[PDB]
Point group: C3
Chain length 323, copies 3
């Protein structure tokens, strides 16, 4: 019945229409800890995003963000972004953060500290290589999967092996992040944001923006297909990560977004609309396997032989189905 906790849940619903219901369904202490983690991550993301904040002002904000968690009066009033309310009323959020058990604070602060560095590192450059794509995805998403896993285990609802496996928790975040990046080409174009790796896109066109023109549609779809093929390499780790989970509320929280990203990839595959117009549930592991496999076959049947990634796309799906 605390006023500030009511407010935190109001903010969670405002900012995260995708995840709020599954966060609210989490058992015991995870529910509040994950709610607060999400809000603080959203605040950090909103600062990163805001192009009205100069790089020299933004670098210290990102570096020092983890420290603001411990400054009861800290807020930021100069943002012009959609989710600015979490920054403007950051004291309500940080107060509830400071009400969490210390074990959860430590994980959250650590992740904010590391994410802040990584976000600041990438402010003045675009992602070049695929290796750099992975690094940027680690900083903004892979670290979240690591942080979530450490929260699951700290709470004891999951076994300590969950939080220990940072490699696969990282792939969980890489998978969701690459999916959103793939899907959001047009949106990000409109916002002068570039997230597709340059070493990939420049084999097709001179400027990433070129994929938005009618005459480059064929090349665009080839590059789309290459990036999807890249994203699919995370699925074996996703399946191993999900298979270790023992708590139903955790399982639901982790599995549903992975399956939803898999559906998104399947719908995006070989789909020119990326550049223009656009009996099972997933709550037990064998069902989640089956659903992932059906989606892989939707991709597999659509692979064009002329596509320059075709062999690789068949190869990764063949790996997913077989092993």
């Amino acid at each position: 019945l605390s006023s500030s906790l009511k407010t935190c849940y109001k903010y969670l619903n405002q900012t995260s229409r995708s995840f709020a219901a599954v966060i609210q369904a989490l058992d015991g202490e995870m529910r509040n800890a994950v709610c607060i983690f999400y809000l603080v991550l959203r605040a950090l993301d909103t600062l990163e995003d805001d192009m009205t904040i100069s790089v020299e002002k933004k670098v210290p904000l990102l570096h020092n963000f983890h420290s603001f968690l411990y400054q009861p009066d800290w807020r930021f009033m100069e943002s012009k972004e959609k989710d600015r309310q979490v920054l403007e009323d950051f004291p309500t959020i940080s107060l509830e953060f400071r009400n969490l058990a210390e074990k959860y604070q430590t994980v959250i602060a650590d992740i904010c500290r590391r994410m802040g560095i990584g976000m600041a590192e990438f402010l003045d450059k675009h992602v070049t290589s695929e290796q750099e794509w992975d690094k940027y995805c680690h900083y903004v998403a892979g670290l979240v999967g690591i942080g979530l896993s450490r929260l699951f285990s700290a709470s004891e609802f999951e076994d300590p092996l969950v939080g220990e496996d940072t490699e696969r928790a990282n792939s969980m975040g890489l998978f969701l992040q690459k999916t959103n990046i793939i899907r959001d080409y047009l949106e990000d174009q409109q916002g002068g944001r570039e997230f597709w790796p340059q070493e990939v896109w420049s084999r097709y066109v001179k400027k990433l923006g070129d994929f938005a023109k009618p005459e480059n549609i064929d090349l665009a779809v080839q590059c789309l297909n290459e990036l999807i093929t890249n994203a699919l390499h995370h699925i074996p780790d996703v399946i191993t990560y999900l298979s270790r989970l023992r708590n139903q509320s955790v399982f639901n929280f982790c599995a549903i977004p992975q399956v939803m990203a898999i559906a998104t990839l399947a719908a995006c595959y070989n789909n020119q609309q990326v550049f223009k117009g656009a009996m099972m549930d997933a709550t037990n592991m064998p069902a989640v396997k089956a659903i992932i496999y059906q989606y892989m076959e939707e991709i597999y049947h659509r692979i064009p032989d002329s596509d320059p990634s075709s062999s690789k796309t068949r190869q990764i799906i063949s790996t997913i189905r077989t092993q």
Copy 2:
């Protein structure tokens, strides 16, 4: 037995909605709940039948529980579609008397209490919201309480499930209120009134004025006020479901509750309650890959329907603050 076979046939004819989940119940609950539903159906059918004078109906409702004990009692004068359960009541009551004594206590107690309550309402419409709660207790709350006592008597669920009659009552009240709200137009065509008079008279002269195209704004305002009232039962519904441990009971209890919030979500601020038909279902993103058969999924499905309502609350609606407030409470608990 041949009589038990006939009871399952009747259950399937008269209970489109619960017949399959009842037949899936484990062990002794299956027969106990099958019989409970049939005698409730019989009682309901007597209550609904407008060719039975008040003079005759009052003793039938008060005395119905006792007919369970009387092997030859039947009723041959019903003009309702479900009348076969009354005409062949001896077959149903025989199986009632075949249940463990502990189940008979529960079923008869409920029938006794429900009959009294229904007889009390033969004479009057629902006035206050407190009166609304009382009516729904009689026709639905008591069913939840009865069912819960059956689960606990069967020992498939902990004693608490049967003991906490307030939570059980809330299960019935939530379903009943949703049904009453959903069914404005169908109960208008039928000539008896269920929306509470103390609420609707703050908007119009007679309840029938809501069907008239010029009163839509007030109609939807009242609709929204009543929905807001029903949302107050959700904490108890989550509490109740979260205490269940048996899969068959969980399925039986959880599915209608999810269907009920789904319905309220479709009705909220919706003109089609009054000048059309409300379509439920259809693609709420994150819950599309959840079935309602584990508690955390059910929590998520409920929370997501709450947000579907919350997103649609317009500032100018007189209840808008109260609707926000209860949803905020459900979210934070």
Copy 3:
């Protein structure tokens, strides 16, 4: 590891080419069952493809069907003369049998035995149609019952299911009979177009002198009647199906066993009293939509709901109408 078996990868590619329906659920099986069932499925498909091929004469075919279980141990054996859609499993049979011989020997024994027995039975039916309902049961045992038996022995041998699962061959047999009878009922028309007859003669001859006649619009009423009789026959396996599923304890096996059965019951319900079975299409048709087939009480509810769908549709006019009601009533009984 990308240095592990390329031949197993090819097997899974074939499993997906040949099973548009089941591949995902087989791939979702725990542990040793995944590959055992994949390979079982592939060798069964190869056997079925030989049996199906009308360009192979009866005299040439019988020895292939009889010896197929031994070809499992002939590393270079393949069959190059098929023109059937799934002929790749025959042409690249060495890749499949290699992976078969890599299964633990306890699973090999089970699969070989079923292939042996299946071959004998298939060969028996090459020169006769199904006459009586007893013969219908026997044919269905040969091509499907035995599959349910073999799978159940794989489940028990893996230790993922109780030993009782593999021992109770009658319940396992009924699982196969239920699917196979449903498929035969649904495929009246496609089977007419390829000149092979599966509806039991002792039944259909009570309605027309020629099974082809059910495709004549003048006999549509007699067709639907005979149809209802066959569905009624198949419904009799449902108590055993429920008993079978109620013994399962491993989620992955449960999903694999229940989904096909639920799909079959849906099909029987969409077919019942439906003349579209003789004219065209047949596309599958509230509580059911809120639960999926992944726990036993939900499966019961789903089944019971399809039973009411049939029940309320029974025409008093129908000659099996009494019998349809009795079997559904029985299904409701336990």
